[PDB]
Structure 1
Amino acid sequence: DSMLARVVRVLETFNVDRTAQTASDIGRRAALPSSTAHRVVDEMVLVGILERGIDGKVRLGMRLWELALRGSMALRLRQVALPHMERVQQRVREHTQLAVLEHNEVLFLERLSHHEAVSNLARVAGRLPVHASSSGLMLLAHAGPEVREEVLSKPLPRVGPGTVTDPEALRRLLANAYRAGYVAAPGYIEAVATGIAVPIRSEGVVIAALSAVQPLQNAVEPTVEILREAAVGIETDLRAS
């Protein structure tokens, strides 16, 4: 019922696949009374958190984008990583992405895509499951015993045809990934794709996963070597900043 709580619920009705809503539809999805929903949306429009387009629909505001991103930890990490990720992207010509753990899910901070690339379900400011993605497996492999036990104790849905949902197999995959310095996950998210992930370290701690998404049929090792090179470059720049 507090204004802040209602404002967060309005923001939560938007998503990766939902850019434009009527203020009525916002009220329904946010469980606000119609009268209240228009008042909250109108106030949020006036301060620029939301915008009305020329089509009259409500969208996340440029002003919100600006205030949320400027000087943010997400932007600072993205700026250090991006030059190296572009060099990966030049060579592999599929997808290059950067992910962190956020409340036991994968959150993507960056995604570069080539024009006719394989399908890719990772979205900037979107999520995928920890157990099912190369990014998640690499991050979970470097998380604490507590976090490993916590994620592996929850119901693990099948995402793609290759998803491993057995806790015992997952522990062994995490062990392999820990030793190898990479994990490939053929078809764990989609039938068409392999995700390949390496760790990004800062002050001896894994803070992110750098990955490629490429066709499942493509060679893994050449992409592993490109990702490892890029990772060293990012770790060098993190040290220097």
Structure 2
Amino acid sequence: SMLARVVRVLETFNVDRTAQTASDIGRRAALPSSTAHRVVDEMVLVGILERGIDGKVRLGMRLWELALRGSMALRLRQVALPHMERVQQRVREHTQLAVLEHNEVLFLERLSHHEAVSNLARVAGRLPVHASSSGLMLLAHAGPEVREEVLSKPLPRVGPGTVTDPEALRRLLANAYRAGYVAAPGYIEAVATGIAVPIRSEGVVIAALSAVQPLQNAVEPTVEILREAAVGIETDLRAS
């Protein structure tokens, strides 16, 4: 399909790849040279891609506009940001907002203080569900079918502290469901603890609000600050 070829072209761009030649796009998308050059030209023609004065193609401003305007991602981030900014003022590490997408964590927003701890979460970037405080919080509220899919895959260690045993994960998830937060000491990187709380709309967890902070930092203060922020978000969501 033309739409399938267009999506494969979009998929060649990534969090640290802004500009490509049609030949490189063809190679990354496993598309024949002629097909890659034709599809790229059509995408440039409608403004989904733009061609710079360097002759390389980039994701187009028209694509950005059509994808964000009125979107669930933009509306939630908009409601969330003032509350995320207050957490950032208080904790001065990282505040981020995430959803589940195809059994991975996708980040809608990330606020970072200068010389905060190392953080691998990227806006419009992904991390594993089982290893991420955000992922474990959201997976705790997913159906048994979603939990089974995720729990039945080989589960790599991401950081030193990553829990990979399916039944140990079920115990974590039950505790997180009960407690209304996940602390994840060194589950992504040795130096970092992720802490995540749920964001609810009409009694459904739609997102996770998280902090990333040095491993040795107190957990309880951050948990409380995120809960307060999450309450603010749910209030503001209910009337938006």
For residue 9 of structure 1, report the CA deviation from its aligned partner: 0.6
User: Whole-Å Cα distance in 1 between the matches of residues 214 and 21 of structure 2?
Assistant: 38
| 1:75-106: CA deviation from partner (whole Å, max 9, x where unpaired) | 11111111101111111111111111111111
Tell me: CA distance 1:32–1:145, structure 2 relative to 1, closer, same or farther (3 Å).
closer
For residue 53 of structure 1, report the CA deviation from its aligned partner: 2.1
* RMSD of Structure 2 on Structure 1 (CA): 1.1
Tell me: CA distance 1:7–1:233, structure 2 relative to 1, closer, same or farther (3 Å).
same
Q: Secondary structure at 2:11's aligned position in 1?
A: helix
For residue 7 of structure 1, report the CA deviation from its aligned partner: 0.6
Which stretch has the larger CA shift, 226-235 or 214-223?
214-223
Q: Secondary structure at 1:154's aligned position in 2?
A: coil
The residue aligned with 2:198 is 199
User: Whole-Å Cα distance in 2 between the matches of residues 148 and 38 of structure 1?
Assistant: 41
User: Whole-Å Cα distance in 1 between the matches of residues 5 and 180 of structure 2?
Assistant: 43
The residue aligned with 1:12 is 11
User: Whole-Å Cα distance in 1 between the matches of residues 99 and 107 of structure 2?
Assistant: 7
Query: How many residues in Structure 1 have an aligned counterpart in Structure 2?
Result: 240
For residue 36 of structure 1, report the CA deviation from its aligned partner: 2.2
For residue 35 of structure 1, report the CA deviation from its aligned partner: 2.1
User: Whole-Å Cα distance in 1 between the matches of residues 185 and 52 of structure 2?
Assistant: 42
Q: Secondary structure at 2:108's aligned position in 1?
A: strand
User: Whole-Å Cα distance in 2 between the matches of residues 164 and 147 of structure 1?
Assistant: 18
User: Whole-Å Cα distance in 1 between the matches of residues 117 and 49 of structure 2?
Assistant: 33
User: Whole-Å Cα distance in 1 between the matches of residues 30 and 146 of structure 2?
Assistant: 33
User: Whole-Å Cα distance in 1 between the matches of residues 126 and 206 of structure 2?
Assistant: 17
| 1:184-204: CA deviation from partner (whole Å, max 9, x where unpaired) | 101100111110000111111
| 1:121-155: CA deviation from partner (whole Å, max 9, x where unpaired) | 11111111110000010001111122222211111
For residue 208 of structure 1, report the CA deviation from its aligned partner: 0.7
User: Whole-Å Cα distance in 1 between the matches of residues 137 and 31 of structure 2?
Assistant: 40
For residue 159 of structure 1, report the CA deviation from its aligned partner: 0.6
The residue aligned with 1:110 is 109
User: Whole-Å Cα distance in 2 between the matches of residues 141 and 5 of structure 1?
Assistant: 33
User: Whole-Å Cα distance in 1 between the matches of residues 181 and 15 of structure 2?
Assistant: 28
After TM superposition, list the pairs within 5 Å mapping 1:11-50 onto structure 2: 11-50=10-49
| 1:2-33: CA deviation from partner (whole Å, max 9, x where unpaired) | 21111111001111122111111001111222
For residue 164 of structure 1, report the CA deviation from its aligned partner: 0.4
For residue 56 of structure 1, report the CA deviation from its aligned partner: 2.1
For residue 54 of structure 1, report the CA deviation from its aligned partner: 2.7
Which stretch has the larger CA shift, 3-12 or 146-155?
146-155
User: Whole-Å Cα distance in 1 between the matches of residues 55 and 219 of structure 2?
Assistant: 47
Which stretch has the larger CA shift, 49-58 or 193-202?
49-58
Q: TM-score, normalised by structure 1?
A: 0.96
| 1:30-67: CA deviation from partner (whole Å, max 9, x where unpaired) | 12222221121111112111112232221111111111
User: Whole-Å Cα distance in 2 between the matches of residues 33 and 206 of structure 1?
Assistant: 43
Which stretch has the larger CA shift, 122-131 or 53-62?
53-62
